[PDB]
Amino acid sequence: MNFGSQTPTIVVLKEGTDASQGKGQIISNINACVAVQEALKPTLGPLGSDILIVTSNQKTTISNDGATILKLLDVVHPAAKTLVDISRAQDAEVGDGTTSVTILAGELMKEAKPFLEEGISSHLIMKGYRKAVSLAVEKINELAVDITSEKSSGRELLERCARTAMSSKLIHNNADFFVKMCVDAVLSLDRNDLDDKLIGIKKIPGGAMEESLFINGVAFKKTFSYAGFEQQPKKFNNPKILSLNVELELKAEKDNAEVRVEHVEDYQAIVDAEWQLIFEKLRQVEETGANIVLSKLPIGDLATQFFADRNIFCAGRVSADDMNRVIQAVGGSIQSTTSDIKPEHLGTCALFEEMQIGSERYNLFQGCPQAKTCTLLLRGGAEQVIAEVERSLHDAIMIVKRALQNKLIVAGGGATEMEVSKCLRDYSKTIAGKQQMIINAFAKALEVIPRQLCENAGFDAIEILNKLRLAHSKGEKWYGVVFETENIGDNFAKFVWEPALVKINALNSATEATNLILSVDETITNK
Amino acid sequence: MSQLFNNSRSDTLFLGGEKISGDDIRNQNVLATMAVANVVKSSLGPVGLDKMLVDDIGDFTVTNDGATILSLLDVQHPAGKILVELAQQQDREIGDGTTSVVIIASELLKRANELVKNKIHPTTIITGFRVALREAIRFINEVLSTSVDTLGKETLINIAKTSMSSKIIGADSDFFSNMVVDALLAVKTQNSKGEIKYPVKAVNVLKAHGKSATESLLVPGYALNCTVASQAMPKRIAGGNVKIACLDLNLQKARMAMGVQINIDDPEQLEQIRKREAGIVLERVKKIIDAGAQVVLTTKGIDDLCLKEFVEAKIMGVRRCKKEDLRRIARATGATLVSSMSNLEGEETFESSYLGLCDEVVQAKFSDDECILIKGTSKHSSSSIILRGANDYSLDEMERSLHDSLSVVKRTLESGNVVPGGGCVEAALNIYLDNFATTVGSREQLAIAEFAAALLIIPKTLAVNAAKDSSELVAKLRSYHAASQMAKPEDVKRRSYRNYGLDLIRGKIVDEIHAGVLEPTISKVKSLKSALEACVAILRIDTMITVDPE
Amino acid sequence: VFMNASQERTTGRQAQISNITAAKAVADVIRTCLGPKAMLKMLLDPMGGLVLTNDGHAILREIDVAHPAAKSMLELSRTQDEEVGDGTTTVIILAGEILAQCAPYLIEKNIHPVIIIQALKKALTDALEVIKQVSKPVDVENDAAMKKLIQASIGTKYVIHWSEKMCELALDAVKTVRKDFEIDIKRYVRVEKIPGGDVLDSRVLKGVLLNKDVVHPKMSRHIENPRVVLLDCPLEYKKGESQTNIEIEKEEDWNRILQIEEEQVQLMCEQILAVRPTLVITEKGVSDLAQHYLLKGGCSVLRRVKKSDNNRIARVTGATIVNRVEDLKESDVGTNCGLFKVEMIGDEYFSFLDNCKESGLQKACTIMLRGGSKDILNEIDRNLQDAMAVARNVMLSPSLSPGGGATEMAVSVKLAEKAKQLEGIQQWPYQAVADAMECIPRTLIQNAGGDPIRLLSQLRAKHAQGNFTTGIDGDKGKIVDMVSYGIWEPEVIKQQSVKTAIESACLLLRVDDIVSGVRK
Amino acid sequence: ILAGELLNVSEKLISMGLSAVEIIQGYNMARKFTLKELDEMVVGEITDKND
Known part of the structure; x- marks a missing residue:
C-alpha cells in the first residue's frame, strides 16, 4: 500500500523552528531582560556613566539615556524588545526617566524569579502587580502640591525643574548658562500649542559649548549661493522677509513644451519672451519692498542677478521643516504667486546679521519680540558631544514642556520610590494571602532606583536604606538621598523638583512590560 | 546571562586563553551552578522524578542518586567540578543527603552573588554564613530526640523507609524495611576494644530479573x-x-x-x-x-x-x-x-x-x-540480598537504592539521637536564624538573613515536584515554627507544634512521629559544612584564568 | 558552552509522552505475532543471515532500537525467556499497552506518577489472587494431560501440524532430564540439528551424537556393549611447562630422546589397557602413534572433543572424567551403553551412542530433528525450547491457569468491580489496569478477523454468570470455554506476564528528563 | 480545543475495533441533539440591544 522504500515521520512544525515551553522558557525570557538591564544599571543617577556603542557601519554614537542606547543595538530576542518599546514610548510621551523605566521593568521580573521557582504559576503573580500599580499611582497624586498655593513666580518654576534633567549629562557643571536657554525657549512657544520641531537644534562642528547663543529668530543655513552672492550686505536693519513656494528657473523643472514656429521673425519674439516672463516675476518682488527672499525650491541665476543690484538677499533650496519654522515668526505666510503678494504678508525684525562659525555661514534673525519660535546653536570639540547635548536639551525642554500643561510638584532622586514602597507594605499586612508576598516584593522592587544612586556614588547602599526605613517610619515626604552634602535629607529644601508625568508613566510602563513577558510561557521562532 | 563576550585588551597579554575579570566570573559561576542544580531539583523528594543518561553505546543509566548523575556528567567549567566532587564526597562519608547538599550549596551561591552586587564584601558574607552555621549546629543539638519507649526494631524500620523514598523501592519499602535492618545487624562485629562498627558493602547484592521485587528472598x-x-x-x-x-x-x-x-x-x-x-x-x-x-x-x-x-x-x-x-x-x-x-x-x-x-x-x-x-x-553471622526486577536496568537502580539505605541505618546505630525529616529541620533553622543577628545587626545582619532563606530551597522544591501549591505549605511551616521559638519549658502546649510538617503525599501538615519519616543527625551535620566550603571556594574567586592546552 | 549537555532538552509532559509513544511502537510490530493465526516476521542481521520467527523474543533481540525508553522494552524479552521461556510475546504486548492504557493521564488529569505507581502495586497484588482462584490443579503423572499442555505453545507455531509427534519429543526430553524437587535444566539438552529428512522420522535418542568418524579403519564401528572412558589429557607427547633443553654430549643420547617419546606415549597406553575400554574419548588432539597401541588392545580413538560434550557423555554412560591416566580405575569406566554405530550422511559423519536405559545422576539425551532446510531447523528448535519449557512449570507448580486470553480477562472483570468500591484518588489508575488487561484477548479477535466490539461485550457478560473458563476461540473467533477447548497453560507463565509488565511500567513513569550523548 | 479532543476521545474507540465509518455517524447524530438542547437553557433572552 505504501509508495516505496520507507517513509520518515513528518515533523509538525517546520524544520529549523525553535520552540520550547514550560517554566524554563520564562526564566530564559527574564534573563534576556536582566542582561539588557545590566548595561543600564550604572547609567542611572547624576553620577551615571556614558556608554560607547559602535554599529556595523562604524558610526560612533554616545548616549547616556536608555532610549537611544537600545536604538543603536539591534535586538533579536523577543522579550528584550519589550524593554526597547517602553524606552521609546517614554521618550515620545515624556522623554525623562527612559532609563529608570527599564530598571523598574526588569527589577519586577527579577523579584518574580523566586516566585516562579515555587509552585505559584505566573497568572497569580500578575494579579499582585496589577493591584499594586493602581494604588501606587493614587499615592503620587496625593503627594503633589499645587504651585499656585504659594503664589510664586512662573518663571522660577520652570528653572528648578529644568536643572533636574541636566543631571547625568555634560551640562551638570555648565547648567548655569544652559538652563537659562531652554527655559526661555518654551516661553516663546504658545502655551496652547507646543512643538518639538520648532526647537530643532542644528549640529555645528567645532566651537565651545558655553559660546552658544539663544535668539528668538531662526537660521535656515545655506545651500548654494548662486552668482551675485557675497556682494550683497549680510547686515540688515529692518528687512522685509518674503518667502516663495514657486521655483524661479528658466525652463528647468517645468515639463517639456514643444514649440513650433514657422517664421524667422516670430522666432526672435519667443526668445525675448522667456526673458520677459522671468523678469516679470522679479519686478513684482521689488514693488513690494522685500529685502529678504526665501524659497523651498532652487533659485535661478537670473533671479539672484536681479537682486544683486538691489542688495536684496535671496537663498533657496531651504527644507520644508525650516520654512514652516520661519513662517511663524515672520507673521504672514508664504505666497507662491508673485502677482498675489500683498504688503501684510511680509515680515520684519529689529536686526539681521550673517556671521560665520565653524567654516559655515548662518543667517540669524534677531530682534523679534513677537516671534513664537526659537533656535539653538550648539558647539563643541567632539561631534559626539554635540549629539549628546542636543539630546540632553531635547529631554530638558520636554520637562518644561509638560510642566506648563499640568503643574505638580513630585519628589525625585529616590524620595518618591521610598515613600510609595512603605505605603504598600502597610496595605500588604492586611491581605493575608498570596498577594502579601507579591506586594512586599513589588515595594522592594521599587527600591532599585535608590540602589544605583548610592552604588554609582561610591557609598554603600546597605547603610543608606537602613537609615531610610528608620526615617520613613514617622511621616515624611520629599526625604531622599543628596549627592552634594553626602548625607540623605529633605529634597524639598534642595529645590530639586520633577514633573508628575515621569513617575506616573514609569510605574504604568514597568507593570505593563512585566506582565507581558510573564504571561508568555512558550516562545516559537520560525526560519 | 553573559552577552557581548569581552573586549580583548592588547596591553594585557597572557599565553593561552583570555583572562576574564570582574562580575562576569561570578555570573558564570552561578550560571554553571544552576546548570547542575536544575538536574537534581526534579529528583528530590518522594514526589521527585529521576533522569536518564545515554552512554553513546546504546546503554543508559536510570538512577535517582544525585552522585551517580553528577559523576556521569564531566564538567569542563573549573568551578563546576566542585559540586560534582561534592556529591562523590557526600555519599562516600555520610551516605545520605547527596541531592540536598547540591541544592543547598547552589542556593548559597545564588543569594551570595546577589549580595556581592549589594557592595557588601564577600568575606563579610562568608563571616555571616560561618557565624550563623555555628549557632545552627547548636540548634540541631537542642532538637535531638533519643529513641525511648519503642517496640522492637520499629525505630530502625521507620528511619530506613525515609531513604527508600524517592526511589523505585519506595512503593515496596514496607517489605524491604525488614531486610535492610536485619542485614546490618548480622554483620555486627567488635573493634576498637568495645566499639561497635559495621562493614560497608558486606551485604552481597545479586541481580536476577524475574518474578517480582516483593518476592525477593533474604538469605x-x-x-x-x-x-x-x-x-x-x-x-x-x-x-x-x-x-x-x-x-x-x-x-x-x-x-x-x-x-x-x-x-x-x-x-x-x-x-x-x-x-x-x-x-x-x-x-x-x-x-x-x-x-x-x-x-x-x-x-x-x-x-x-x-x-x-x-x-x-x-x-x-x-x-x-x-x-x-x-x-x-x-x-x-x-x-x-x-x-x-x-x-x-x-x-x-x-x-x-x-x-x-x-x-x-x-x-x-x-x-x-x-x-x-x-x-x-x-x-x-552474615546476610545477603538478591534483588529482583523486570529488567537489568531496574536492578542497577535498586543496587544504589539498597546501598543508600544501608548507609542511613549504619549512621543510625552509631548515634542514638535522630531528627525529624521531610523539611522539618530546614523550616526550623529559618526562624531560629531570623531572630538571630538581630542583636548584633550592623552590616552582618543582611548576610545572615539571606543564609536563613537559603535553606528554604529544600522545602520549596519538594512542593513543586508534587504538582501542588507550594505557597500554601510554606506559609504553614512558617506559621507553627515562628511563634513557638520563645516558649518557656513549662505549661506545655507550645513546642508540641513545629516538630512536623510538609507531607508531600497528602499535601497536609501531619505529625512526622506518627508518619515514621526520620533522618539521622549525622546526615544533617557535615552536610552544611561541606556545602559551605563549596560556597566559600567559589565565592572568593574574582578572576578565572584559562590556559590553552599544549 | 558547559560540559556535555543541552542540545535539545526534552522537559515537561512531552518527555513522558515520548516515552509512551516509543514504547507503544514496540508492541505494535509484534502485535500480529500473538495468537494461533499469528503471521511471521523476517529479520535481516548485519552478519548476513536470516531470522524468521513469530516469537517476540527473537524478533526484538536482533532488531537494533536506539531510544532511552524503547530499549527498556527490549530487555523484557530476556526476562520471560530466561526465567520461563514461554510468553515473551504476551509480556511485550501487555507491558506496551499498560503504559498507554493505564497512564494516558498527566496529559489531561495531571496526576503524579508515584500516585499511579501506588495503585499499580495494589493492582498487582489483587491480580495474583484472581489468577490463583481461577487456576485448577492438574495431575503431573498423567501422560495424556501433559500432551495437551505442551500443545499450548505449539498451537501458535508452525509445528502444530506435527503437534501429535511433537508432544512425544517434548515429554520424553523433560522426563529424562528431570532428577529426583524435580529440578531440570536445558544445558544438558542438545540442540544439534540434522539438515534434510522427514519430521516424522525425527526422534529423541538417548546419548550424545558425535559428528566425527572413527580415526582408524580397523576401529570397530559396531559394538554390542561399548565401554567409554573420558580423557582430558592429549595422547600426544607433553612438552611441559618449562623447557627441557637437553644437552647431548654423545650421539647415542639423541636417539634415546626420540625413543623415549615413543615409549612414554606407550606407557600411557598400557595403563589405559588395564581397564580394556572399547571406546576412548580424548578432549584434545591425539597423535598417530598412540592409536596403534590402543588398536592392538581393542580401544577406539576419536577426534578432539569440546568441553561441553564431555559433560553429557559422562551422564549417559555414568562415566567419570579421568585426567590422570595412572589414576584410571574400573570404577570410573562408563558402562551400560546400548549401541555404537556410524551412519553415512553427505555433509558429515555421525556417531551414535545408545543408552541401555536400565536413583543416581540425571540422564542426558539429544534431540534429533529432520527439517526441510537449515532455517526450518532453527525455527523448530525455538519451538521445542518454548514447548519443553511448559513442562517445567507444571512439575514445579502443579497449579494450572486458564489459557486463551481467559486469565487476562478474568482479572479485568475483578478490577472493574473493586474500582467503584475503592473510590479515592487512586480509582482512575486502578480501573485503568482492567482496560490494559483486555487488550491481549482483543488481539486474538483482530488476528482471527472477527468483530471485537460484539465478541468482547458478550465475553464479559458470560464471564460472571457462565464460568471463569470462558475465552476467545483462536480458529473460529467465537465464544468458547477452556474446559471443552482442551488446552490450558501453567500459572507461572501468567504470573510472569503480570508481574514483569507492571514492574517495568513503574520504571518508565518515573522518568523526568532525557539527555543523550553525555559521554562513554 | 473541542476539535482536538474529539480526536483524543476517539483513541479508545479505534483501539476497541470501531471502524471510522460508524464513528462519523456517531458524531453527526450527537451534534444534532446538541444544537436542539441549547435553546431551552437560555435565560438571557433580551429584546433591547440598545442600552
Whole structure:
C-alpha cells in the first residue's frame, strides 16, 4: 500500500523552528531582560556613566539615556524588545526617566524569579502587580502640591525643574548658562500649542559649548549661493522677509513644451519672451519692498542677478521643516504667486546679521519680540558631544514642556520610590494571602532606583536604606538621598523638583512590560 | 546571562586563553551552578522524578542518586567540578543527603552573588554564613530526640523507609524495611576494644530479573556469585558442620621460576622431571582432601588436572572470585584466609583450624544464573540480598537504592539521637536564624538573613515536584515554627507544634512521629559544612584564568 | 558552552509522552505475532543471515532500537525467556499497552506518577489472587494431560501440524532430564540439528551424537556393549611447562630422546589397557602413534572433543572424567551403553551412542530433528525450547491457569468491580489496569478477523454468570470455554506476564528528563 | 480545543475495533441533539440591544 522504500515521520512544525515551553522558557525570557538591564544599571543617577556603542557601519554614537542606547543595538530576542518599546514610548510621551523605566521593568521580573521557582504559576503573580500599580499611582497624586498655593513666580518654576534633567549629562557643571536657554525657549512657544520641531537644534562642528547663543529668530543655513552672492550686505536693519513656494528657473523643472514656429521673425519674439516672463516675476518682488527672499525650491541665476543690484538677499533650496519654522515668526505666510503678494504678508525684525562659525555661514534673525519660535546653536570639540547635548536639551525642554500643561510638584532622586514602597507594605499586612508576598516584593522592587544612586556614588547602599526605613517610619515626604552634602535629607529644601508625568508613566510602563513577558510561557521562532 | 563576550585588551597579554575579570566570573559561576542544580531539583523528594543518561553505546543509566548523575556528567567549567566532587564526597562519608547538599550549596551561591552586587564584601558574607552555621549546629543539638519507649526494631524500620523514598523501592519499602535492618545487624562485629562498627558493602547484592521485587528472598547468610568448575560436582551439601576451605592457592600446572634454566645430560630424566611438575601440586591437595573439606574456595582458576580428585572425593571446586568476597566467608565460618600455605616448621602441613563451619552449602539457580547460598554460619553471622526486577536496568537502580539505605541505618546505630525529616529541620533553622543577628545587626545582619532563606530551597522544591501549591505549605511551616521559638519549658502546649510538617503525599501538615519519616543527625551535620566550603571556594574567586592546552 | 549537555532538552509532559509513544511502537510490530493465526516476521542481521520467527523474543533481540525508553522494552524479552521461556510475546504486548492504557493521564488529569505507581502495586497484588482462584490443579503423572499442555505453545507455531509427534519429543526430553524437587535444566539438552529428512522420522535418542568418524579403519564401528572412558589429557607427547633443553654430549643420547617419546606415549597406553575400554574419548588432539597401541588392545580413538560434550557423555554412560591416566580405575569406566554405530550422511559423519536405559545422576539425551532446510531447523528448535519449557512449570507448580486470553480477562472483570468500591484518588489508575488487561484477548479477535466490539461485550457478560473458563476461540473467533477447548497453560507463565509488565511500567513513569550523548 | 479532543476521545474507540465509518455517524447524530438542547437553557433572552 505504501509508495516505496520507507517513509520518515513528518515533523509538525517546520524544520529549523525553535520552540520550547514550560517554566524554563520564562526564566530564559527574564534573563534576556536582566542582561539588557545590566548595561543600564550604572547609567542611572547624576553620577551615571556614558556608554560607547559602535554599529556595523562604524558610526560612533554616545548616549547616556536608555532610549537611544537600545536604538543603536539591534535586538533579536523577543522579550528584550519589550524593554526597547517602553524606552521609546517614554521618550515620545515624556522623554525623562527612559532609563529608570527599564530598571523598574526588569527589577519586577527579577523579584518574580523566586516566585516562579515555587509552585505559584505566573497568572497569580500578575494579579499582585496589577493591584499594586493602581494604588501606587493614587499615592503620587496625593503627594503633589499645587504651585499656585504659594503664589510664586512662573518663571522660577520652570528653572528648578529644568536643572533636574541636566543631571547625568555634560551640562551638570555648565547648567548655569544652559538652563537659562531652554527655559526661555518654551516661553516663546504658545502655551496652547507646543512643538518639538520648532526647537530643532542644528549640529555645528567645532566651537565651545558655553559660546552658544539663544535668539528668538531662526537660521535656515545655506545651500548654494548662486552668482551675485557675497556682494550683497549680510547686515540688515529692518528687512522685509518674503518667502516663495514657486521655483524661479528658466525652463528647468517645468515639463517639456514643444514649440513650433514657422517664421524667422516670430522666432526672435519667443526668445525675448522667456526673458520677459522671468523678469516679470522679479519686478513684482521689488514693488513690494522685500529685502529678504526665501524659497523651498532652487533659485535661478537670473533671479539672484536681479537682486544683486538691489542688495536684496535671496537663498533657496531651504527644507520644508525650516520654512514652516520661519513662517511663524515672520507673521504672514508664504505666497507662491508673485502677482498675489500683498504688503501684510511680509515680515520684519529689529536686526539681521550673517556671521560665520565653524567654516559655515548662518543667517540669524534677531530682534523679534513677537516671534513664537526659537533656535539653538550648539558647539563643541567632539561631534559626539554635540549629539549628546542636543539630546540632553531635547529631554530638558520636554520637562518644561509638560510642566506648563499640568503643574505638580513630585519628589525625585529616590524620595518618591521610598515613600510609595512603605505605603504598600502597610496595605500588604492586611491581605493575608498570596498577594502579601507579591506586594512586599513589588515595594522592594521599587527600591532599585535608590540602589544605583548610592552604588554609582561610591557609598554603600546597605547603610543608606537602613537609615531610610528608620526615617520613613514617622511621616515624611520629599526625604531622599543628596549627592552634594553626602548625607540623605529633605529634597524639598534642595529645590530639586520633577514633573508628575515621569513617575506616573514609569510605574504604568514597568507593570505593563512585566506582565507581558510573564504571561508568555512558550516562545516559537520560525526560519 | 553573559552577552557581548569581552573586549580583548592588547596591553594585557597572557599565553593561552583570555583572562576574564570582574562580575562576569561570578555570573558564570552561578550560571554553571544552576546548570547542575536544575538536574537534581526534579529528583528530590518522594514526589521527585529521576533522569536518564545515554552512554553513546546504546546503554543508559536510570538512577535517582544525585552522585551517580553528577559523576556521569564531566564538567569542563573549573568551578563546576566542585559540586560534582561534592556529591562523590557526600555519599562516600555520610551516605545520605547527596541531592540536598547540591541544592543547598547552589542556593548559597545564588543569594551570595546577589549580595556581592549589594557592595557588601564577600568575606563579610562568608563571616555571616560561618557565624550563623555555628549557632545552627547548636540548634540541631537542642532538637535531638533519643529513641525511648519503642517496640522492637520499629525505630530502625521507620528511619530506613525515609531513604527508600524517592526511589523505585519506595512503593515496596514496607517489605524491604525488614531486610535492610536485619542485614546490618548480622554483620555486627567488635573493634576498637568495645566499639561497635559495621562493614560497608558486606551485604552481597545479586541481580536476577524475574518474578517480582516483593518476592525477593533474604538469605540468612552470605551468598557468593560464581560458577562451578566441573558440572559433575554436587550442587547441594547435606548434613551439618560443612567445612569450607578459603585458599588463595590455585591448583594448576605451573612453570618454575624464570631464574631457573633446566639443563639435563640424560634422556632418562625427562620422565621424572615432567611428572614431578604435576606431583608438587598433588602434595598440597592431598592433605586437604584427607581433612574432609566439603567446599574448597580458591582465588584463582583451577585446571582440570586437580579437579579429578574433587569428583571422586565429592568435593565442590571453585574458581576465580573477588578477593574481598572470600575474606568475609572465612571470618563468618571460622576459617583463616591463607595467602600462601606454609608452617613454622620447614615441612608442609595442614591444620584443621583453617577449615570453616556452617550448616549447609547449596547452589541455587536464579533464572539462568547460578550462585552459592551459604546459610547458618558458625563463627559470625552474615546476610545477603538478591534483588529482583523486570529488567537489568531496574536492578542497577535498586543496587544504589539498597546501598543508600544501608548507609542511613549504619549512621543510625552509631548515634542514638535522630531528627525529624521531610523539611522539618530546614523550616526550623529559618526562624531560629531570623531572630538571630538581630542583636548584633550592623552590616552582618543582611548576610545572615539571606543564609536563613537559603535553606528554604529544600522545602520549596519538594512542593513543586508534587504538582501542588507550594505557597500554601510554606506559609504553614512558617506559621507553627515562628511563634513557638520563645516558649518557656513549662505549661506545655507550645513546642508540641513545629516538630512536623510538609507531607508531600497528602499535601497536609501531619505529625512526622506518627508518619515514621526520620533522618539521622549525622546526615544533617557535615552536610552544611561541606556545602559551605563549596560556597566559600567559589565565592572568593574574582578572576578565572584559562590556559590553552599544549 | 558547559560540559556535555543541552542540545535539545526534552522537559515537561512531552518527555513522558515520548516515552509512551516509543514504547507503544514496540508492541505494535509484534502485535500480529500473538495468537494461533499469528503471521511471521523476517529479520535481516548485519552478519548476513536470516531470522524468521513469530516469537517476540527473537524478533526484538536482533532488531537494533536506539531510544532511552524503547530499549527498556527490549530487555523484557530476556526476562520471560530466561526465567520461563514461554510468553515473551504476551509480556511485550501487555507491558506496551499498560503504559498507554493505564497512564494516558498527566496529559489531561495531571496526576503524579508515584500516585499511579501506588495503585499499580495494589493492582498487582489483587491480580495474583484472581489468577490463583481461577487456576485448577492438574495431575503431573498423567501422560495424556501433559500432551495437551505442551500443545499450548505449539498451537501458535508452525509445528502444530506435527503437534501429535511433537508432544512425544517434548515429554520424553523433560522426563529424562528431570532428577529426583524435580529440578531440570536445558544445558544438558542438545540442540544439534540434522539438515534434510522427514519430521516424522525425527526422534529423541538417548546419548550424545558425535559428528566425527572413527580415526582408524580397523576401529570397530559396531559394538554390542561399548565401554567409554573420558580423557582430558592429549595422547600426544607433553612438552611441559618449562623447557627441557637437553644437552647431548654423545650421539647415542639423541636417539634415546626420540625413543623415549615413543615409549612414554606407550606407557600411557598400557595403563589405559588395564581397564580394556572399547571406546576412548580424548578432549584434545591425539597423535598417530598412540592409536596403534590402543588398536592392538581393542580401544577406539576419536577426534578432539569440546568441553561441553564431555559433560553429557559422562551422564549417559555414568562415566567419570579421568585426567590422570595412572589414576584410571574400573570404577570410573562408563558402562551400560546400548549401541555404537556410524551412519553415512553427505555433509558429515555421525556417531551414535545408545543408552541401555536400565536413583543416581540425571540422564542426558539429544534431540534429533529432520527439517526441510537449515532455517526450518532453527525455527523448530525455538519451538521445542518454548514447548519443553511448559513442562517445567507444571512439575514445579502443579497449579494450572486458564489459557486463551481467559486469565487476562478474568482479572479485568475483578478490577472493574473493586474500582467503584475503592473510590479515592487512586480509582482512575486502578480501573485503568482492567482496560490494559483486555487488550491481549482483543488481539486474538483482530488476528482471527472477527468483530471485537460484539465478541468482547458478550465475553464479559458470560464471564460472571457462565464460568471463569470462558475465552476467545483462536480458529473460529467465537465464544468458547477452556474446559471443552482442551488446552490450558501453567500459572507461572501468567504470573510472569503480570508481574514483569507492571514492574517495568513503574520504571518508565518515573522518568523526568532525557539527555543523550553525555559521554562513554 | 473541542476539535482536538474529539480526536483524543476517539483513541479508545479505534483501539476497541470501531471502524471510522460508524464513528462519523456517531458524531453527526450527537451534534444534532446538541444544537436542539441549547435553546431551552437560555435565560438571557433580551429584546433591547440598545442600552
